[PDB]
Structure 1
Amino acid sequence: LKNPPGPWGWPLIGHMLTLGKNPHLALSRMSQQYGDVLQIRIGSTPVVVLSGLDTIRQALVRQGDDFKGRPDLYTFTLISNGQSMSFSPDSGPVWAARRRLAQNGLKSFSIASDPASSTSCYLEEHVSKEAEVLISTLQELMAGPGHFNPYRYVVVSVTNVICAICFGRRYDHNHQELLSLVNLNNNFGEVVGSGNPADFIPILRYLPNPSLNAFKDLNEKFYSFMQKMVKEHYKTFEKGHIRDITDSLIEHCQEKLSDEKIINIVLDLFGAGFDTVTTAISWSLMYLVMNPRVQRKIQEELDTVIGRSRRPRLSDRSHLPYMEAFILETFRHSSFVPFTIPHSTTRDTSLKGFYIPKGRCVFVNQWQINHDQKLWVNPSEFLPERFLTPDGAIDKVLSEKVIIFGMGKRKCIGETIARWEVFLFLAILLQRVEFSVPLGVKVDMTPIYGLTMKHACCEHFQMQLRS
């Protein structure tokens, strides 16, 4: 048919300099000229970059089986001993079977009803517990220091939820086992983010690379923690009393695809679990602090729809259209997952009249959709009201153009869990407390590129109870 178009690139390094430190911004300007299917080169490796709401739906959904593979990148082979469900090049029926195990394991210990509490489910019970511990920890910080860095304590509250779902345990707010793994050891996004030169320039792996060495250690540390957590569950495993997702995977090793590819699925769940949800909640607090106008509106809605006599529940999610418009605009404006995990073609295929051979690396630019000047009014501006119709309800036609959970056969499997976890944490907190940042302190809202885009650490947040 045709080869996908693209700008001129150096014969040796390709367009690696055009990408720069923000490949999502460069490839969004590039799509304005070369279209929804364009081709670049990182070093000598060709890469196809998909942009556009309809073209990405055409490729990942309607032709999903043509794009459901992962490329064979170097950085991916360092994840979970090279056998990760999400990052391994395996995309046949072996992957499809592991994905179905994860989906069923999640539904059982997140959305399913809790035997302990008749009213709520597992997720609502865990989030309610951790949101109270979080509010108490922040009250203690206002008793002394008078300020705090939220990420340090949100990451614990969010980890205790996904950790209770995967290992049936929780940890205190000041635990060295936990913070070592999750905090200040998470350059996973920085190393795995699409366009990493080390994947396409083979010499950068062997040179002095401080980030790549800390990455090998982070994974080796996590894989050891998994072995400790699974061996301890195997030592007390009772068939019939399934405590968490780990037990249902142990149960599935005895009921019949190696045992390692079954057990290390919790590493993908635990990993994606705390990294994305913590990033999302962290960004939310930044926007509430920089836009006190919209924090006041979220609270005026909570006071009308729920009052202050009872904690918000999952049932209230559909009766709070402004809270959902805020969370949607946090996902759209930040786009803290600017690219999906890189895809790969499983066969010679055709897309919008362009030929893509088998094995071609494929990037999916979610950031471009969420800031397309043709789909949005003031994309650079943070304006939650853009999702509200004239009668104050969520515009469903427009809200389903916020692409951040992926699409197709490789779509996020914890999407529904993240939307409820994010809603509850924000709803329970903003009902009780009000966050702020004093004047005259810098608050760098600039995203830092990575698989999940984080922000500069802010240590000046404050919190007060409400009347």
Structure 2
Amino acid sequence: GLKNPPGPWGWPLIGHMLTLGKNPHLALSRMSQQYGDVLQIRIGSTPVVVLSGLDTIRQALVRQGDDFKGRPDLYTFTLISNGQSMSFSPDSGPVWAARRRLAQNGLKSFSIASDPASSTSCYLEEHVSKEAEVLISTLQELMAGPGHFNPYRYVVVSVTNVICAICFGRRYDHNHQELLSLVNLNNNFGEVVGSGNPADFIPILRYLPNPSLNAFKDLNEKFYSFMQKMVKEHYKTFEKGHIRDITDSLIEHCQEKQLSDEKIINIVLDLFGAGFDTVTTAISWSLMYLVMNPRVQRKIQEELDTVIGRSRRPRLSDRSHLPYMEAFILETFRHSSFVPFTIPHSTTRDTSLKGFYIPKGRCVFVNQWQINHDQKLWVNPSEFLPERFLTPDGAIDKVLSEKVIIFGMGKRKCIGETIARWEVFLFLAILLQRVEFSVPLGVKVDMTPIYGLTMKHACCEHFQMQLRS
């Protein structure tokens, strides 16, 4: 038959806003244990259905994909890309799918396709090798200097120049101030649009003195200013036959052609933003796990010494033949789950899920964190143990690696998964082959994640690095 989704009691005006608290991913996981994989809360007066369970989510996002492919009409999204963001706009219909096809093509055309200037590698491998070595020599300068560094500061530039080369054909010095301007100055994007923001559900918090949202509104049109001054710089030097960027890839499509040319050109912003921010957090988390688990660091290097040695620079060729790193990366994604919730979803129409009615327009949270820490899928899920993914013969258990959910599911799946998987692998491979990372004893290193759409960690200034052998 049909039932309504269960759920706990909530306050008549604010709902469950206080039981979510500072860490919705944790509050809604405990709630799932009691009420199950399909439950119901209210943030203010706005109902929300929360989805947990590996297969319950797969059933909704994949098997009933177009019932669950929408995006809710939340305020914070209206301030992203002038209210016309592909990834955050309410547009779910054909206008959206088209822009998604243009971003998928522009991505693979200037990332995995072979570089004309190299018979060896693809675009992505060239860029990541360049920044990987610049980053190493940069980091050495700092041990010669202060003797210690915060890695996030310099990884964010090296990561950004990769996605900045795929998109704008330009890179920036590690101290270019108009860049830290963008990517390393009051970047609270993730913390504001993380699922459950009070300002999206409490209409008066948008008008009261809100520093966190004033910083947010200035960040987004400071990024929209950057985009317009790089596409105008590109149309001044654009040549029909020779496409250099993803930007020129879209300028081309504007010429060939409800699909505004604004809606085509501001796609590169969604790529540039998700590119630099997410991959950076992954690498930064990986290095926070290497410092705090030296055993895992050496066994990564031990594998690199036996499968490639120190005679040659690693390549994407070697990704398939390095199982223990694929395990470390998978466990960095799983233990941290630095993307605890997908971007909120919305129902396109009345539908049902595991026997529960959900009407059209209902806001939906997808608790990826709950999957990666479900104690019935993982033995000891709070422990960082990459070995959990390795078979008795030292290979990757592919069925258990496909239970790690961090790139979403269904028709709204991340379109930069393989880029992020290759970029994260290559960066870590080139660095760990030639250097080791360390934090002296007696220093504080808070591993506690900070909630957000992409959870970050507390800044750590005490990283050290020395070369090997």
Partner-residue secondary structure (3-state), 2:172: coil
Partner-residue secondary structure (3-state), 1:178: helix
Cα deviation, residue 240, structure 1:
1.0
* Cα deviations by residue, 1:15-67 (Å, 9 ceiling, x for unpaired): 00000000000000000010000000000100000000000000000000001
Partner-residue secondary structure (3-state), 2:47: strand
Q: 2-side partners of 1:383 and 1:186: how far apart?
A: 31
Matched residue, 2:140: 139
TM-score (norm 1): 1.00
Matched positions, count: 467
Matched residue, 1:16: 17
Q: 2-side partners of 1:456 and 1:201: how far apart?
A: 28
* Cα deviations by residue, 1:422-467 (Å, 9 ceiling, x for unpaired): 0000000000000000011100000000000000000000000001
Partner-residue secondary structure (3-state), 2:338: coil
Cα deviation, residue 184, structure 1:
2.6
Partner-residue secondary structure (3-state), 1:355: strand
> What are structure 1's unaligned runs of at least 5 residues?
none
Partner-residue secondary structure (3-state), 1:18: helix
* Cα deviations by residue, 1:189-212 (Å, 9 ceiling, x for unpaired): 010000000000000000110000
Q: 1-side partners of 2:181 and 2:464: how far apart?
A: 25
Q: 1-side partners of 2:105 and 2:459: how far apart?
A: 36
Q: 2-side partners of 1:249 and 1:148: how far apart?
A: 39
* Cα deviations by residue, 1:137-163 (Å, 9 ceiling, x for unpaired): 001001110000000000000000000
Matched residue, 1:412: 414
Q: 1-side partners of 2:32 and 2:185: how far apart?
A: 35
Equivalent positions of 1:70-89 (< 5 A) are 70-89=71-90
Equivalent positions of 1:51-62 (< 5 A) are 51-62=52-63
Cα deviation, residue 112, structure 1:
0.2
Choose 194-203 or 176-185, whichever is displaced more: 176-185
Q: 2-side partners of 1:222 and 1:210: how far apart?
A: 18
* Cα deviations by residue, 1:108-166 (Å, 9 ceiling, x for unpaired): 00000000010000000000000000000001001110000000000000000000000
Identity of aligned residues (%): 100
* Cα deviations by residue, 1:234-277 (Å, 9 ceiling, x for unpaired): 00100111001000100000001110000000000000000000
Q: 2-side partners of 1:131 and 1:362: how far apart?
A: 39
Matched residue, 1:304: 306
Choose 184-193 or 226-235, whichever is displaced more: 184-193
Partner-residue secondary structure (3-state), 1:445: coil
TM-score (norm 2): 0.99
Cα deviation, residue 186, structure 1:
1.1
* Cα deviations by residue, 1:339-365 (Å, 9 ceiling, x for unpaired): 000000000001000000000000000
Q: 2-side partners of 1:181 and 1:169: how far apart?
A: 15
Matched residue, 2:342: 340
Q: 2-side partners of 1:220 and 1:406: how far apart?
A: 27
Q: 2-side partners of 1:49 and 1:403: how far apart?
A: 16
Cα deviation, residue 185, structure 1:
2.4
Q: 1-side partners of 2:240 and 2:336: how far apart?
A: 44
Q: 2-side partners of 1:366 and 1:183: how far apart?
A: 27
Q: 2-side partners of 1:375 and 1:18: how far apart?
A: 26
Partner-residue secondary structure (3-state), 1:110: coil
* Cα deviations by residue, 1:253-304 (Å, 9 ceiling, x for unpaired): 0001110000000000000000000000000000000000000100000000
Q: 1-side partners of 2:82 and 2:160: how far apart?
A: 23
Residue in structure 2 matching 1:395, options 387, 391, 397: 397
* Cα deviations by residue, 1:49-88 (Å, 9 ceiling, x for unpaired): 0000000000000000001010000000000000000000
Q: 2-side partners of 1:261 and 1:289: how far apart?
A: 43
Residue in structure 1 matching 2:437, options 431, 435, 438: 435
Q: 2-side partners of 1:116 and 1:69: how far apart?
A: 41
Partner-residue secondary structure (3-state), 1:300: helix
Question: Where has structure 1 moved over 3 Å in runs of 4 or more?
Answer: none
Partner-residue secondary structure (3-state), 1:362: strand
> What are structure 2's unaligned runs of at least 5 residues?
none
- Note the aligned Cα RMSD (angstroms): 0.4
Choose 347-356 or 181-190, whichever is displaced more: 181-190
